[PDB]
With several copies, the nearest count.
Chain A
């Protein structure tokens, strides 16, 4: 999906600036959204079209 609003950019920029690239990436993959949409065993796909 694309970003929904500017607060996402602010939060992720601060997360990076404070914790590094590894934490920045973990915030995406360990997020509840990835786990509910794709879970452990599904390859990510462009789901924002629907």
Chain B
């Protein structure tokens, strides 16, 4: 995150519509559970792989906001 492109991070508001809990019913809750709506803040250098992992899981995002400007 030394260069300028590393900063200008983004904040993602993620909803937990049942499309991921339906798979995790089969995978298993081998960690303590949390509520539905939660917000993650990701830097630009890994924004794409972050939301890609979320969608591989099956996350539904309501809105995405730019933290810097």
Contacts and interface: CB of A to CB of B under 8 A. Distances in A.
Direct contact of A and B (CB under 8 A): yes
| Band of interface residues on B | under 10
Contact of B32 (A26, A35, A36, A41): A41
| Band of interface residues on A | 10 to 19
Query: Is chain A's interface secondary structure helix, strand, loop, or mixed overall?
Result: mixed
Interface in A1-50: 26, 30, 32, 35-42
Contact of B30 (A26, A32, A37, A40): A37
B27 interface: yes
Interface of B: 27, 30-32, 34, 46, 49-50, 53
Contacts of A38: 31
20 contacts: A26-B46, A30-B46, A30-B49, A30-B50, A30-B53, A32-B53, A35-B53, A36-B27, A36-B30, A36-B31, A37-B30, A37-B31, A38-B31, A39-B31, A40-B34, A41-B31, A41-B32, A41-B34, A42-B31, A42-B32
Nearest to A38: B31
Contacts of B46: 26, 30
